[PDB]
Design a protein around this ligand. Structure first.
Ligand SMILES: [Mg+2]
Ligand SMILES: [Mg+2]
Lengths: 245, 244
């Protein structure tokens, strides 16, 4: 029953209908602090903005927008400075458009969640497979948060949630999925004065399939980029050709 | 060699590397037509990407991503390269940022396509020669399915101490959040170390602090660590589809 501290961010910026819908739904049963970008960051790199002062705007309701802040900037500032006591969880969304595939790491929605993966509860990244039923997506997120406060799930990770763009009553249920994959298939030029020649035009368990079949898709993600297997197969490769003239 | 980057075909880091590498190896430059450090690094999956070709051979993909430059370079524009390299970046690529880095991304498209790949970055602004020298030394190797991720101190080559096989950190422990004001009184926040330290003994972060070339074997993480049943059981135990 008790009040969970939620850091809410996104990719689409403080004004987006997705984050503002979710925030209203969440403020009914949780303490919500919005720290989001000052603009829509679709197509924009994610990174922590280091050693460069970030200006902070405060809205009437207390939402805060970070001037030129990436989704990771917002999460970093929210976790370490802007939400006191420190948030229990980071929620990122609701994003306008899906976040499916192995390409999700390059998305700002996932990136914000990823930045909040070390908190008390695993981070949620929430995307709507469209632009209409934010209500459905906000409902699915609430169910998830209630569940986490009931029986906690292991931290250090994120759940990537994709919600079909459907009325709540038409959603068939929730599946635990794994990410899909979309991609040599390059084509030919067609410029009117032939300005250039070199051109391009570039599973039953995948997240794509569950969403297409009308289900909420939940993919558990973690970041691990090193093998102890690689660490010394290049270390003995380095000490092979050491210092010498 | 296919040489690309994140900061553009005219970038100092890539030009200094392409010149130093043209000593030992043959290089084909395919890089974005503009600085992309602020742009997303995914492939542009369903559009027609124009290319520009300079007198020296260099190719610039118009509005290209760093991965686009590797994909479009290999399977459409360039004999097949021996090693795909991602030019000397202006600025570090340390810890969590490697997931987000355009420089790292370009190397990643390389090994997905099935090539050896190198990504290199300068922790500063001045000593591209130092970084080029380090890369040339490294490329001079016996001439893993993982990319090396290399970070170089911004020092004259003679001031550089060693070379460390490192792993990635998350975020630097020394990087704190420091509240500030501007002359207008606006509230501002500054992320980073107030001076000097305390980094993980084996991390990419640590090496650079101590004047050492960080080299990390790398592969991006979209895995679950087979934690699919852990969550599957969690949705059954707690009512998540109940209230509808
Ligand atoms: Mg977005
Ligand atoms: Mg760059």
């Amino acid at each position: 029953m008790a009040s969970m501290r939620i850091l809410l961010s996104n990719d689409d910026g403080v004004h987006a209908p997705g984050i503002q819908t979710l925030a209203k739904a969440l403020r009914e049963f949780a303490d919500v602090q919005v720290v989001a970008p000052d603009r829509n960051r679709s197509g924009a790199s994610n990174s922590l903005t280091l050693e460069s002062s970030l200006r902070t705007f405060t809205f009437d309701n207390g939402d805060i927008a970070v001037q030129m802040g990436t989704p990771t900037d917002c999460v970093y500032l929210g976790v370490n400075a802007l939400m006191r006591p420190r948030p229990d969880i980071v929620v990122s969304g609701i994003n306008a458009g899906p976040n499916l595939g192995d390409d999700v790491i390059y998305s700002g929605t996932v990136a914000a969640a990823m930045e909040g993966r070390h908190l008390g509860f695993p981070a949620l990244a929430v995307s709507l497979n469209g632009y209409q039923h934010y209500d459905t997506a906000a409902a699915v997120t609430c169910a998830l948060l209630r569940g986490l406060s009931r029986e906690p799930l292991r931290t250090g990770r994120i759940l990537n949630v994709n919600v079909p763009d459907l009325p709540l009553a038409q959603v068939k249920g929730i599946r635990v999925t794994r990410c899909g994959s979309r991609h040599a298939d390059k084509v030919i030029p067609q410029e009117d004065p032939r300005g250039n020649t070199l051109y391009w035009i570039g599973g039953p368990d995948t997240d794509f399939a569950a969403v297409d079949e009308g289900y909420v898709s939940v993919t558990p993600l973690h970041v691990a980029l090193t093998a102890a297997s690689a660490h010394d197969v290049v270390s003995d490769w380095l000490d092979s050709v050491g210092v010498g003239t």
